[PDB]
Design a protein around this nucleic acid. Structure first.
Lengths: 91, 90, 92, 89
DNA sequence: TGTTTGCTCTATGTTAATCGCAGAGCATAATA
DNA sequence: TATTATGCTCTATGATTAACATAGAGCAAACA
């Protein structure tokens, strides 16, 4: 189909998640949602893509689960992030 | 919508496309493609939407069709170009 | 979550998907939906989880996208199928 | 991450147990299948509403059993199963 | 009489899962 | 040579509900 959004013209809802896993290092499904305001349903489906690809792993701390970046994760979250600013500088 | 995929971890084709328009001034259809590495079809319907919203404008400099950013698009470009550095600050 | 539903009283949507991948090898999300009569939206929702948990892997050559079971994938399957063969067994 | 209910549902065991036994207390089915009690009732609450099982209060001893409509569904769903298993080979 | 021990089911909030609609990424066939 | 239509894919996420855990609470026979 076509396009219609004011929320994600430039940044994906994923970027807000990976970034918040840098600022906080490790977070919880619910928690990510709140201090990012990205809908919970969206967060879980994304952290799930991150789990599969290895950018994140979970720490089941009791009745709760915690999602945190990895070597590969912190890597992408950093290097690929540079590409962001390396082209944001030019403007 | 199909916002974030594999090809697009951080930025949408809208990003690479608008930016490239700030860079080149007025690129054509395929031009934005070859540069941004984004598949043509994706590009063309994002431009179809940029026209719709008034961020881009059709231009007839020759037989072919070139695309430039309106000031409205530029205001969007710059404006959200800060939510990129801002959020990234951490 | 919601595991037991009017449509899933005994088997879950996973039970059907995994077994389709078993029988078929590689399959498109659609295909799996079309063969299990499980709504598509339910299908990727669980594929996406099977990817996270490393039971399933994505194979895509540009347009065509497939999904196969990993090795823990075929492991989970035969182990689950066991808890089942055992179930109905004790039921007789 | 419902690694607890991957192929089968809590409903699957609850019913299958009430076939093996016919009569059981809520606390019984729960203990005897490793299913949290609060899940067992909420399920029995549905099983009663859809009329698949029925209550029986002989004093302060409450028991649950399948209706005819229950065993019907029981041995029926167990067929969608029986079907699915063997087709894997 | 009343409190305790103990069993039972009820009230219900948090998270997680079914699965629906409106996207949107992109490839190809169709059309200007 | 480029745009739109067509259509198959996955995504964004919201509505409904289940899984199950915390805190009741109806109410038995057993202490004090």
């Amino acid at each position: 189909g076509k396009i219609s959004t004011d929320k994600y013209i430039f940044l994906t809802p994923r970027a807000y998640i990976i970034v918040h896993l840098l600022k906080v290092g490790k977070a919880k499904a619910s928690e990510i949602s709140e201090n990012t305001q990205i809908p919970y349903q969206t967060v879980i489906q994304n952290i799930r893509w991150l789990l599969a690809e290895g950018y994140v792993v979970k720490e089941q701390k009791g009745e709760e689960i915690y999602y945190k970046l990895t070597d590969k994760g912190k890597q992408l979250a950093t290097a690929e992030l540079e590409k962001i600013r390396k082209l944001v500088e030019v403007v």
